[PDB]
């Protein structure tokens, strides 16, 4: 049950920063009330995603060292992580602890919302898989944290400067792995795995986009820019 002071600080700071913003009540219950419609569901889901993107961009702005990085690189990392992050969040939301409320319902909206059942089946498989890992808020926070902090992102001019900030997070997730799940482990390798995994999922994602349609509705200008089009 190790965990140095420098680490617990970081984890405490990150876990603080992780649960601050949160999804606005309005957009949230919007899935509980209001009803179905392949076009409505698309609007709801497409609204949220636009929100999540705002939240995320705040979290990454208050992640140790972040504002210290070259301005361009900062974009890059955000442009770079936006989807994957959402995947993790998506993961976190779905599997694990059913608060017996809206979430199980969120899946219905996704199911039949102009999204081909050929993409929601493998995707919802992946999520079930990370679910097998039985993670904790901390892991999700760190995973998201380390993912936003990837030096191997298509355009960042200075990778060393990004790593410095990434390693610490990485070292905290690792030692955090032994502790919560020592039975194996490999669990820390497995996780870094899913990271490499969702990276190819960002690939199926841009494709499935150009085929998602729904009447003729459009994507919020933000998504159009962070989901390319």
């Amino acid at each position: 049950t190790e965990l140095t002071v420098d680490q617990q600080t970081l984890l405490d700071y990150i876990m603080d920063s992780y649960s601050k913003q949160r999804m606005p009540q309005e957009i949230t219950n919007k899935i509980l009330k209001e009803e179905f419609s392949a076009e409505e569901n698309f609007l709801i889901l497409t609204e949220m995603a636009t929100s999540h993107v705002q939240i995320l961009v705040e979290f990454t702005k208050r992640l140790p060292g972040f504002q210290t990085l070259d301005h361009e690189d900062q974009i890059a990392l955000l442009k770079g992580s936006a989807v994957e992050a959402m995947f993790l969040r998506s993961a976190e939301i779905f599997n694990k602890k059913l608060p017996a409320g809206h979430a199980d319902l969120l899946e219905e909206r996704i199911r039949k919302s102009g999204i081909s059942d050929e993409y929601i089946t493998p995707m919802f498989s992946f999520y079930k898989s990370v679910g097998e890992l039985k993670m904790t808020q901390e892991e999700y926070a760190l995973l998201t944290a380390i993912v936003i902090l990837s030096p191997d992102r298509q355009y960042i001019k200075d990778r060393e400067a990004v790593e410095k900030l990434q390693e610490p997070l990485l070292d905290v997730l690792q030692k955090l792995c032994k502790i919560y799940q020592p039975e194996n482990p490999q669990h820390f390798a497995c996780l870094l795995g899913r990271l490499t995994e969702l990276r190819t999922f960002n690939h199926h994602h841009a494709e499935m986009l150009m085929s998602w349609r729904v009447n003729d509705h459009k994507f919020t200008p933000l998504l159009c820019e962070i989901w390319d089009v």
Partner: peptide, 12 residues
């Protein structure tokens, strides 16, 4: 040009 994101980066 990622103008929307930039705007969200600097004071959201």
């Amino acid at each position: 040009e990622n103008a929307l994101l930039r705007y969200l980066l600097d004071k959201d």
